[PDB]
């Protein structure tokens, strides 16, 4: 009947003679009460993916922003965005009321991440995380933490860990949440008692909670386009200047900045030249989802484009 298999101490597969995998199993057993043989059975099926390793290693004016923008802001995407917003309008409104994060932002994030559930990833999360945890020294500690959390997530949401698919880095569902984001920020927004990253309502609430947790200020401006050029100052989402310094550099805001006394200097390559912007706190909050000026601007503008297409 019950097969303890205490003597089955050597698992097979791609991670068979991997010390990192052995240490990881020990940690799960010691810290979380996992069973060594059960975990060995799961990991013996995990695959070491060369592609996952290659991709993690891989990471004017010439119209740079224009090229990035058109990857996301197209008639098909805007139209699908309108369909998603209308379909989940109650959840979006509820997220706005509870977290202070507007529908255009949530719709923009989910659109850029997975085209509203159409492209959620084809790689088994277990394979990606095991590969990065056991055969990638550079970020092994980070990924081992993600694998630990993933296995705990599967246990708690009662998922077979081998059945879940996602990105080459282990990101999941509509919002491409990493396991650590599920742990710290995902919420049961549907009200069914579970937190399902593949449930659009749970994903909407989870993205909203992630935003509020990272400082989203309800009703505050994201960024304000500037008139003028500031070629002498370094730019990017990580920069920080007083409004006074930006003025001395030749900039004026197109919309009043209210009480904001500092801003990042964003510069978008529009082909014919450069378009400068005053980046406000909420813009930086968007970059907390993906550290990129282009990403945050695409998320924001896609959401704006969808909001406008809904009005028509
Ligand atoms: Na739920």
Swiss-Prot record:
Annotated membrane topology: Lipid-anchor
Name of the top EC class for this enzyme: lyase
Enzyme active site: 113
CDD domains: Slt35-like
Keyword terms: Cell outer membrane, Cell wall biogenesis/degradation, Lipoprotein, Lyase, Membrane, Palmitate, Signal
Cell membrane keyword on record: no
Record's subcellular location: Cell outer membrane
Main location group: membrane
A Pfam family per the record: SLT_2
GO biological process: cell wall organization; peptidoglycan catabolic process
Record GO cellular component, one term: outer membrane-bounded periplasmic space
PROSITE patterns named among the record's database cross-references: PROKAR_LIPOPROTEIN
InterPro entries: Lysozyme-like_dom_sf, Lytic_transglycosylase_MltB, MltB-like, SLT_2
GO molecular function: calcium ion binding; lytic endotransglycosylase activity; peptidoglycan lytic transglycosylase activity; sodium ion binding
Catalyzed reactions: Exolytic cleavage of the (1->4)-beta-glycosidic linkage between N-acetylmuramic acid (MurNAc) and N-acetylglucosamine (GlcNAc) residues in peptidoglycan, from either the reducing or the non-reducing ends of the peptidoglycan chains, with concomitant formation of a 1,6-anhydrobond in the MurNAc residue
EC number: 4.2.2.n1
Function recorded in the entry: Murein-degrading enzyme. Catalyzes the cleavage of the glycosidic bonds between N-acetylmuramic acid and N-acetylglucosamine residues in peptidoglycan. May play a role in recycling of muropeptides during cell elongation and/or cell division.
Subunit note: Monomer.
Protein name, UniProt field: Membrane-bound lytic murein transglycosylase B
Organism: Escherichia coli (strain K12)
